Amino acid sequence: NPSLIRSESWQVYEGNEANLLDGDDNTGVWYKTLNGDTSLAGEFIGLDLGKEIKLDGIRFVIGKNGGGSSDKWNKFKLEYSLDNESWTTIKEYDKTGAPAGKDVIEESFETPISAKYIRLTNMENINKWLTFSEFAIVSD
């Protein structure tokens, strides 16, 4: 029963947050960002897994079709935590100039990674709102 965690200041402009956990790439959410339509570095979205589990991989789908198809971070990282206080980076991304629309962020770990929380986190201020479609883990 993983649940969504995300930056509290974002407003749900369209869609609904259950759409991010329904296993359908075609359903998403469009968040309005405050601070003058700016997502600041450190903002995040991901999963609280409820308990510490061994992860074999993740598959997160950022962006969505139509409205807000370009509304994505350009620099962000995948990180995990056991306690929701200390984080460890798995990968850093630069998707400047990525095509508009859904972008599948998928990683596989040869040796499982133990985590209770796992998320994408903005690395650089960007003057955009934000769309997402799906957050999933691969485990056990």
With binding defined as CB under 5 A, does residue 65 bind Na ion?
Answer: yes
Q: Which stretch binds Na ion (CB under 5 A): 52-60, 82-90, 100-108, 117-125?
A: 100-108
Cβ contact 92:123 at 8 Å: yes
**DSSP secondary structure letters along 59-112:** EEEE--SSTTTT---SEEEEEEESSSSS-EEEEEEE-TTPPSS-EEEEEEEEEE
Site for Ca ion in 11-70 (CB under 5 A): 19, 22, 24, 27
Which partner, Ca ion, Na ion, none, binds residue 65 by CB below 5 to 8 Å per kind?
Na ion
Chain residue whose CB lies nearest Na ion = 101
- Single residue of 6, 72, 102, 119 touching Na ion by CB under 5 A: 102
The type of residue at 45 is I
With binding defined as CB under 5 A, does residue 112 bind Na ion?
Answer: no
Could you give the count of Cα atoms lying within 13 Å of 42 in the half-sphere of its Cβ?
3
With binding defined as CB under 5 A, does residue 124 bind Ca ion?
Answer: no
Under DSSP, the state recorded for 20 is G
With binding defined as CB under 5 A, does residue 131 bind Ca ion?
Answer: no
